[model samples]
Target: VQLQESGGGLVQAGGSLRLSCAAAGRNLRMYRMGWFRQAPGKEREFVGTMVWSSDTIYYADSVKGRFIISRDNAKNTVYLQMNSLKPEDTAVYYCAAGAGWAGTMTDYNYWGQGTQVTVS
Candidate 1:
């Protein structure tokens, strides 16, 4: 599976941002996908996961209120939207795909190059 993340570059604090990931080499509806972010000099944070088959999403408590995850089965794409951004939110975000149950926690086997978002 391959993923490419895009969209958003500079956003103001308290503003909103949108990003997208396009999946190829596999049927996205058959697997699970996740969104993650890494601030410079910090470890990556798992933002959330979406179960394509169920259209259900689970978010990390740290981003639950400000981040939203969605998908377009027809386009084989996943999306992330965040509101009320802050300077601390500046980071590189990535999208990854997983297979089975174990994959959800350990799978993130395939990942995008990542999109860099800056909050000013």
Candidate 2:
């Protein structure tokens, strides 16, 4: 399913960010959804991922307790919510699909346009 982003904000110190991606090509039950963060001037880092259809979930080693991922297979959409954000968190965030490495690992083939959040 194609992914689209919605509900994001400009990054500001202490501001919160919320992003949602709706899948539009296949059934959500057929695959899983994932989330990643791309800070300004930094590489993309895996946040966490979840399989709404199967109830499977996985997290990245770098992420801590602030990131939350959830999905709705019925609506074909997934959500990434973050709170207590700092200036360092300001950047682009995207919702993707999968839970393995690139070849041997689960990789996200589909990615949203990315919601840009900047903190001052």
Candidate 3:
């Protein structure tokens, strides 16, 4: 399976950012998906995930409405919506999938190299 990401902007605080992970080679409906991010010098964070089969889509608490994720079943894509960006939000964010393989939080088995977003 392959996931290709697009969209991230170097912008000022309070701007909005939208990112998409276009997927292929495997049916997204058959797998659960997730997101991650790493700052310049910090450990990567498991940002969010969606298990469509179980109707579960939960994200990190620090983000709440500030960071959002959604899926396009027909398009087989995943999206991230970040609003009111802040300097602290700068990082490289990625999206991945693999839940169909096992009952674990292991989406990184295959991932789309994402965008390095910076909010100045």
Candidate 4:
């Protein structure tokens, strides 16, 4: 599978940042795309997931409307746009696979090299 993320820049405390992840490989409809974040020197955080076929989406309890996920089956791509940025949002962003189950859980088997998006 392949994934590409685009869009990121300095977002003032109240500004917004929109990022997109274009994906390919296998029938994306058979898989799931999730957005993750990593603070410098910290661990990865699961932000949300957007199912391809179902067109249904889910997010971590902690994440609110500040995050958005979009997908295009015809184009085999997805997008993650975040708004109302804060200094804490400064970090690396990634797109990965989600397992979609309890006990079974989810993980980022593959990841983007990481886009160091800093909010300043």
- Best candidate according to TM-score: 1
Flag clash pairs in model 4: none
Q: Would you give me the overall lDDT of model 3?
A: 0.81
Error of 3 at 108 (Å): 3.0
By TM-score, is 1 or 4 better?
Answer: 1
- The positional error of residue 14 in candidate 2, measured at the CA in angstroms, is 3.4
lDDT of 2 by residue, 45-66 (tens): 8878776645656777654666
The lDDT values for all models are 0.87, 0.72, 0.81, 0.74
RMSD of 1: 1.7
- Which model, 2 or 3, shows the larger TM-score? 3
Assess candidate 1 and give its TM-score to the true structure: 0.92
Predictions: Cα RMSD each: 1.7, 2.9, 1.9, 2.2
TM-score of each: 0.92, 0.79, 0.86, 0.85
TM-score for predicted model 4 compared with the true structure: 0.85
Kindly report which residue stretches of model 3 are placed more than 4 angstroms away from their true locations once superposed: 101-104
Clashes (backbone N, CA, C under 3 Å), per candidate, total 1, 7, 0, 0
Model 4 score (lDDT)? 0.74
Error of 2 at 110 (Å): 1.3
Candidate 3, 21-115: lDDT as tens digits: 88876465677678888899999887888765765678897677688888787887788888978898899988888846675545456788888
